[PDB]
Amino acid sequence: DQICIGYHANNSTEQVDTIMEKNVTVTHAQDILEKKHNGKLCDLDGVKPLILRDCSVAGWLLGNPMCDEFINVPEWSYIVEKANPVNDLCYPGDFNDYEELKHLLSRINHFEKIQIIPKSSWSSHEASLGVSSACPYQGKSSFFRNVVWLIKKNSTYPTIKRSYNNTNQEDLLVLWGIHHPNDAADQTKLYQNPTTYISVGTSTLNQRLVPRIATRSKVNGQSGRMEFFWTILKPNDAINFESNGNFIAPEYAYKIVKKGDSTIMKSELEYGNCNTKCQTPMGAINSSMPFHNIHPLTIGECPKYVKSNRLVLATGLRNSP
Amino acid sequence: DQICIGYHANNSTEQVDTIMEKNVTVTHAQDILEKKHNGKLCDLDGVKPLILRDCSVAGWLLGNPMCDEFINVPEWSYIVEKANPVNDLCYPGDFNDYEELKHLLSRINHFEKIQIIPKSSWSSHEASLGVSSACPYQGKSSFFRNVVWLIKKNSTYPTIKRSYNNTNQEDLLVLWGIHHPNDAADQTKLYQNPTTYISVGTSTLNQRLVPRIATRSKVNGQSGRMEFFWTILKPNDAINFESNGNFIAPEYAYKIVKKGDSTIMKSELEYGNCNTKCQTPMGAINSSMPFHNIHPLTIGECPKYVKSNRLVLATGLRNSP
Amino acid sequence: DQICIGYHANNSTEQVDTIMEKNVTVTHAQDILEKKHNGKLCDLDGVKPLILRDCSVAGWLLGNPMCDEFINVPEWSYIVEKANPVNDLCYPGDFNDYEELKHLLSRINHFEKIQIIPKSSWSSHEASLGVSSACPYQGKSSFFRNVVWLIKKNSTYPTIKRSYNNTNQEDLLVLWGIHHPNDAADQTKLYQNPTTYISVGTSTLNQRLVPRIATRSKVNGQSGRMEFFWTILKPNDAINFESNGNFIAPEYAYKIVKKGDSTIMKSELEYGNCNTKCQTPMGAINSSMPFHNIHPLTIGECPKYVKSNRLVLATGLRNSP
Amino acid sequence: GLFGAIAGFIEGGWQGMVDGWYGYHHSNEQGSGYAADKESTQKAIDGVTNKVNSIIDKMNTQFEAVGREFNNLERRIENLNKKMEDGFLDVWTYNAELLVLMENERTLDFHDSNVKNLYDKVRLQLRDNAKELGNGCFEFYHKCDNECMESVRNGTYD
Amino acid sequence: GLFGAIAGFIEGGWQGMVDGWYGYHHSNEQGSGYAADKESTQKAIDGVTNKVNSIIDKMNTQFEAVGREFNNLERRIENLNKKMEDGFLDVWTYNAELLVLMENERTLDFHDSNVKNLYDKVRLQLRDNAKELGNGCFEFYHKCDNECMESVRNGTYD
Amino acid sequence: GLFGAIAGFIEGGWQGMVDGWYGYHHSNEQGSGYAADKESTQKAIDGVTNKVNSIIDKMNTQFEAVGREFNNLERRIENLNKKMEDGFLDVWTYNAELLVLMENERTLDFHDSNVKNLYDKVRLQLRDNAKELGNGCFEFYHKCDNECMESVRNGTYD
Ligand SMILES: *[C@@H]1O[C@H](CO)[C@@H](O)[C@H](O)[C@H]1NC(C)=O
Ligand SMILES: *[C@@H]1O[C@H](CO)[C@@H](O)[C@H](O)[C@H]1NC(C)=O
Ligand SMILES: *[C@@H]1O[C@H](CO)[C@@H](O)[C@H](O)[C@H]1NC(C)=O
Ligand SMILES: *[C@@H]1O[C@H](CO)[C@@H](O)[C@H](O)[C@H]1NC(C)=O
Ligand SMILES: *[C@@H]1O[C@H](CO)[C@@H](O)[C@H](O)[C@H]1NC(C)=O
Ligand SMILES: *[C@@H]1O[C@H](CO)[C@@H](O)[C@H](O)[C@H]1NC(C)=O
C-alpha cells in the first residue's frame, strides 16, 4: 500500500521564458500582449474622424477650392492627414507658425465657421478679381475661399482701416495673408502703390508686414508668394487691420466650439466604416490585454504600447512530457 | 521533555505589500516616504527667498513703481512668483526673450543695481515728462523707474549717440525699450520726427529697432505699446546706443554679483517666518526619509520625489494573530 | 566508511555584490564593464576623421584663409572640433542658423566643392578689392575664400541680378552673406548707394536682407560685421540673387555627395594614428564587454554606456576561506 | 527547480489529476486513484492571480507618445523629440520584458515550493509508519485502506 | 512562504520571545521558557539592514525636475518639456514601488529560510534521540534537564 | 544562504575538487578522494550561461546620447536636452546596477539549491543504511568499498 505526492500535467504546449531558461512548457499561461489590429480607420466611441484625404490642415483652414468637402465639418474625434497631401497651398507660399497651429488643433474637436468681413463690404477696392490659375475650381481660376485677394478699384488703392471685435463667447481663429509679388511692375498692376504695408493689431498682437519683392522659381506656374498668418482672438477683443496693398483679407473666421482630446495622425488609409474604442494610425484595437505592440501613437482607451514580439506570463507549472 | 523552534510575534499592526499578497502584517517595518510638509514658504539655510507677491519678474527688473519694495533686494536663496501677478508691465507691451531671462535668473542669487546713464545727463531731450497714467505712483502719472521715456526738447529731437563701457569686473544686465505709438500724430507730438530707429550695439549685439505704428485695443487705457529688450554686457565691453526717437533709455542696470543654485517657483503662498533645508512650492520638508511625495519642484537637500501614496519596507517577519 | 556531499573552492579573490551582502568572494565571476580606452582619436573602420584642429565648422565652410588645410577634404567618418577654435569668423559677425547646419552635418560624410559664380564673372563690380586685415593670409589682407566681397567699380554699384540653377543630381549647400558697416560714410565708400538690399530666392526661400548700420565695439580691430546665411538648393531648382550693395556673393558651393552616420565631437585631442571600431571624445574602445563607462557620446559598434565604476556578475559560488 | 520537487525527485506530472495543481495518488487492495489537495491548490490560485493583477496594475502608468510636428529648420528639436519618445518606449519595453522573465521564474519556483511543502507535511505524519521511497511515494508498513488513506490527506493520521 | 516554516509547519509566532527573531522553547520537569538564538538573529539583522541601505542608496540618483517657462507660441516644446518630466517621474515611481514589492517578498522568505535552517540544524543533532512531532517541536526519549537543554541550543548535543 | 547548504551545514568548499562545481568525497579502507557530479554541474553551467546571455541581451537596447548644439539664446532647450540625456543615463545605470545586484543573489542561491538537492538525493538512497552526520557526510553501517561507493554516485544504491 502506497501514497504519493504529485502534481498536474496536461497536453498544453504553451511556452514561457525565464532568465535561466527559455521555451519552458507550462500547463497554463497568460498572454498579455495584443498583436492584432483590424487595419482600418474607425469611429472613436461612435464619433467619426475628420479624414482629409488629399487635403492638408493648411488647405482645409484657408479654404483651398479643392477642399470643398470640408467647407462645413461636424465634431470630430481625431484628425487624419496623409504624409504628403497634394492639396495644400495651391498658390505657393508659407503658413506662419504652422506647427504651433496644428498643435492647437490637437486640443480642439469642433470648429464653426463664421463670416467676419463680408465680400460685399469692400467699397473702395475690387474683391472679385483676386483669383489665380494656381488655384483652379471647375476649370476656372479661383482662390482660397476663406480669405479675399483685394485689388485696386479703377486704378486706386485707398488705405484700408478695418476693425472686428468678437462679440462671440468663444475664441476665434482669424486667418489672413500677404502677397509677395516678383517685380515692381506687378506691384503697380495689382495694387498701384509701390511701397506698402499691412498692420495687424489685437490686445496682444502688434504686427506690421512688408512685402518682399524678388524674382523666384515658378512653383505651380507661379513666382508670386502668399504668406499666411493667424491669431487667436479672445472674446471682447478687437482685431484692427490697416493696409494700402498686398492684403489678403479675412472673409471667414473659425469659432472654436469644443475643446477635447484629439490628435492629427499620419495615415495613408481611408475610412473603414467601423467603430472602435482604441485607434492607431495602422488600424483599430479591440482587446482587454494590458499591452499591445501595434503603434506608439494611439487615441482612446488603449493598452500600453511596448516594442515586444511576445509577453507571456506563466500561471501554471512546468509541464512534463 | 520537549524543545521547539519558533519565531517572534508581537502586537504590531504595520502592513507591507508583496507581489503575491497585499496587506501582510509584519512584526517590524520601515516607512521610507515623507508625506508631510508644513505648508509654508521658509528661508533656505537661513537665507530668505525673494518673494514678489503681486509683482512679476518683468515688473521687478524694469522697475514698475508699484514694485518699490524691490528697489534694493538682498541676496536671495530662491524666488517666488504668483501664477498671474497683477503688477507686471503697467504700460502694456512685450518683454523680448523673457523666458530666456527668467532662465538666467535661476543661476543668479544676487543683483546690485547701478546707474549707467543718469537722468541729469540728457541735454538735448526732455527726461522728466516721459510718464503715463497706466503706471501711477501715489496718485500721479509715473513710469518704470529703471528706464527713461525720452521726449523732444522745445520741439526738437536730435539724434542720440550714447556709449557705455562696463568697467565693472562683473557681468551687467542692461535693459532698454522702444515705444510703439498708435498713429502718425502721436509720433509727431512725442518725438517730432516721423520715421525713426533705435540701434543698439555691443561686441556681439547688432540691433536696429523700428517702431510699429498701428491702432490697437486699449490695454489698461492705453493703445501705445512698449517693447523691452535686454542684453548681458561682458566686462571691458561697451554698449552703443543711437536713436532719433521712440527710445526708452537705460537709467539703471543690474550687476550680477553672485551665481548660485536658485529657482523661480510658482506659489500663491506668502512668507511663513520659518527656516528649512528643503523647500517646495507647497511647503517645506523636514525629514530623513529617502523619498517624499510632496511636489516635483524642490530646492535644497531633498528626498527624491515619487508619485506614491505609500512606500513601506518589511524588516521583520510575518506577524501571527 | 564515509561519503560526503560538497562543493568547489579555489584561490579566487574576485568579489561580487548582492542586495544583502557586499564584497562576497566567489569562485568565478564575469566583469561586464569596459573601463579602459587608449586616449587617442583614431580612424573608424579604416576611415579617417575630419580633425579641424584650430578651425571651426564656420571657419571651414566659409573658407577662412587660415583653414587652407581644409580646402579639399576626403570622405570622413566623423568630425572633431575643439571647445573654442581660434580660427572662426576672422572678420567678426554671425552665422545664421548655425546649429541647424552643424546638425545637418552629422548626417553627411562627404562634401565636394564646386564653383557656382566665378570671380571672373563680375563685370560691373570690383571683385579683387574685397579683403580685410582681420582675415590675413601670408601677411597680406585676404578674405573668406568661398564668398566674394563685392565693391563698386569706378564709383558705381549697378543692381546685381544673378541666377544659378543646380544641374547637379546631388543637393547643394549654398553660402552667402551681408556686410553691416558702422557708419553712413563707409557705406558710400564701399558701395556708393545709401539704402541697400540683398534679395535671395529659391523655390522655398523668400529672403530680403537689409544692412544694419551702427557703431559698435572693435572685435578683431573691426567694427563692421558680416552675417552669413545658407540654404540647401534642391536639384532642378534655381537660386536668384538681387542686390545693389553689401552683398557677399557665393563663389564656391558644396555638393553633398554622401549621407551617412556621423557626429561632430568636442575634443582637445589630436590625431592618434590608430584604427578602431568604437570612438569616444576621450579615446577609442576595443572590447567585447556589453557595457563601458568611458563617455556617453560614441560612434561605431560600441558597448552601452553606464555611469558605473563596477559591474561584476557572479557565475560560480561562495568561495570558502 | 530551486525546491527540488517538480522534475526533481518527483520525475513528472500526472495527466490523471485534472482536479487541482497538487495532490495525492493512493494504491491499495481496494484500488487506486487521484485526489487534489484543495487547500494548497487554492492558495496557489490566489497567489498567482494576485501576482498577475499586480503586474498589470504596476504597468498601467507607462509613457504615452504624442504627435508633434516641426518645420525644416527645427531639426534639432524634432530629433530631441524623437530620441525622448523612443527613449521612454525602450525603458518601458525593458521594464515589461524583464518583469515577465523574473516573475515567470518565481512562479515556477512557487509551484515547486508548494509541492515540496505538501510532500514534507505528509512525511512528518507518516514518520516510521512508512518507507520513504525516494520518488514522491511512501510505502506503508501495515495495510492501509481507503479511510486510512483519507486520513493522510486530511491531516489526521497516526 | 517558500520555505514552509513560518505560518507553515510552525503555525504561529511567539508573543513570549522578545529576545530575538528566532529561537527555542523548552519544557521539562524544572520548567519552561524562551531563548533567542543570537547567531541567526544577528545574521538576519545584518542582512535586512544592508538591504535597506542598498535600497536607499540605489535610489538616490533619481530625476530632478526643473522649472522652465515658455511663451504662448512655444506650446510644442512646453509640452515636450512636460511629457519628459512626467515621463521620468513615472519611471522612477515604477522603479521604487516595484523594488519595494519584490524585496518585501524576499525579506519574508529570508526569515522563513532562517527559521527552517535553524530547525534543520536542531533536527540533525537530535537524530533518533527525539520524536519529530511535526509542529516545530521535538519530544525527547530520555529525560532532558536544563543543561541537556542548553546543549541543543549550543550545538553540543549527543 | 537560503537553502542552508553552502557555508551552512556544509561548512566550507573543497580545494581538492577541481573536477566540477558539486560532487562527492568518499573514504574507506581502499582510500579516499573526490568525484564531481557531472549532471548537476552541467545543469548549473547551462543555467548560469543562459542567465548571463539573457542579461547582456536585455541590456543592448539602451539610450544612445547624441551631440546637439544650441546658441546663447536657446538656454532653456539646451538645458532640456541635457536633463533628458542625463535622465536616461541615470535610469539605465540604475537598471544595470540593480539587475546585477539581484541576479548575483539569485546565482549564489541557485548553487546553494543545487548542493542541497544533491545532498537530499543521496540522503533518500542511503536511508537507514547510514548515519547522517550533520555536516554533509553519511557514515555507513556496513563496509562500503569502491563499487559500493560508485553505486551511491550513480543512483543505484540499495
Ligand atoms: C524557442 O522557441 C521559439 C518558437 O517556438 C523559437 O523561435 C526559438 O528559436 C526558441 N528559442 C531557443 C533559445 O531555443
Ligand atoms: C532649372 O534648370 C533645369 C535645367 O535647365 C530646368 O530643367 C528646370 O526647369 C529649371 N527650373 C527652374 C525653376 O528654373
Ligand atoms: C489593504 O488595506 C488598505 C488600508 O488598510 C485598504 O485601503 C485596502 O483596500 C486593502 N487592500 C486590499 C487588497 O485588501
Ligand atoms: C469690444 O467690443 C465689446 C462689445 O461692443 C465692447 O464691450 C468692448 O469694450 C470692446 N473692446 C474693445 C477693445 O474695443
Ligand atoms: C568592499 O571592497 C572594496 C574594494 O575591495 C572597498 O573599497 C569597499 O570599501 C568594501 N565595501 C565594504 C562595504 O566593505
Ligand atoms: C572698454 O573700456 C575699457 C576701459 O576703458 C577699455 O580698456 C577697453 O579697451 C574698452 N573697449 C572698447 C570696445 O571700447
Numbering used by the authors:
A (entry chain E), B (entry chain E), C (entry chain E): 5 to 325
D (entry chain F), E (entry chain F), F (entry chain F): 1 to 158
Could you give the paper's own sentences about this structure?
Thus to better understand the nature and significance of such adaptive changes, it is essential to monitor HA changes that may affect receptor specificity of avian influenza viruses, particularly during human infection.
In both structures, there was clear electron density for only Sia-1, the 2-6-linkage atoms, and two or three additional atoms of Gal-2. Binding was, however, still less intense than to α2-3-sialyl analogs and relatively poor compared to that of the human H3 virus X31. This was also reflected by the poor resolution of moieties other than the terminal sialic acid in the HA(Glu186Asp)–LSTc complex. In contrast, the Glu186Asp substitution was not detected in the sequence of the clinical specimen and therefore most likely emerged during isolation in MDCK cells, although the presence in the clinical specimen of a minority population below the detection limit of the pyrosequencing method and subsequent selection in cell culture cannot be ruled out.
